[PDB]
């Protein structure tokens, strides 16, 4: 997973 603006996806 990777995080973008707080959310992991």
């Amino acid at each position, epitope marked *: *997973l*990777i*995080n*973008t*603006n*707080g*959310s*992991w*996806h």
Partner: antibody
Amino acid sequence: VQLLESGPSLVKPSQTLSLTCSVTGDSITSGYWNWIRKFPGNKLEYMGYISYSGSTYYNPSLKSRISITRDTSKNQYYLQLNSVTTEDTATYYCARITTAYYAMDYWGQGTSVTVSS
Amino acid sequence: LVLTQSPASLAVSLGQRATISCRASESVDSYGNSFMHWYQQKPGQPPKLLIYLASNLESGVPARFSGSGSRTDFTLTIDPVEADDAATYYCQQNNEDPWTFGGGTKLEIKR
């Protein structure tokens, strides 16, 4: 993994606070690299990270006056907090997040910052 | 999202069980994981990772510590509690913006 913070102990109000975190045993081009502070009274506040690719995420209640930067050839990243006030007195921590844990596993000993004239 | 740590403090006797709760106003679960973590902090020391992803034990942490829950309801349990466990404990969620710490729970040892 070892994280060392540096910066000034005493900053005057309405001026900019600048802290450095030096990393050893790991490269800042992997994972995420966070700033955390603890206010007097013990409440903890997450400030934000800079990612392995240079992208940032900021606490919405600080996004206006915070900037997080880095220098890959020094294994350092940097916290900047503008227009400080006495309410920004705290102990400031950097910390690491890896995808192995998705939590802040390695911290540095804090740095104490007092905002005062 | 709001993390309510309960209780704010908690006195327990040596060898007994201590449970600390942390409730969120929205689920901190995504992609099959609970993005909830528990930290211990003592004076003059950074916080220490005890339990990541709600139930997983950090290496070098004694199995007296354990966490459980999903969605919006999580607990940490120390059983049996030891004298070295006197400290403040924090939950933390990083599933979604804004990342936030709990208010903390001061654990006292009754002797």
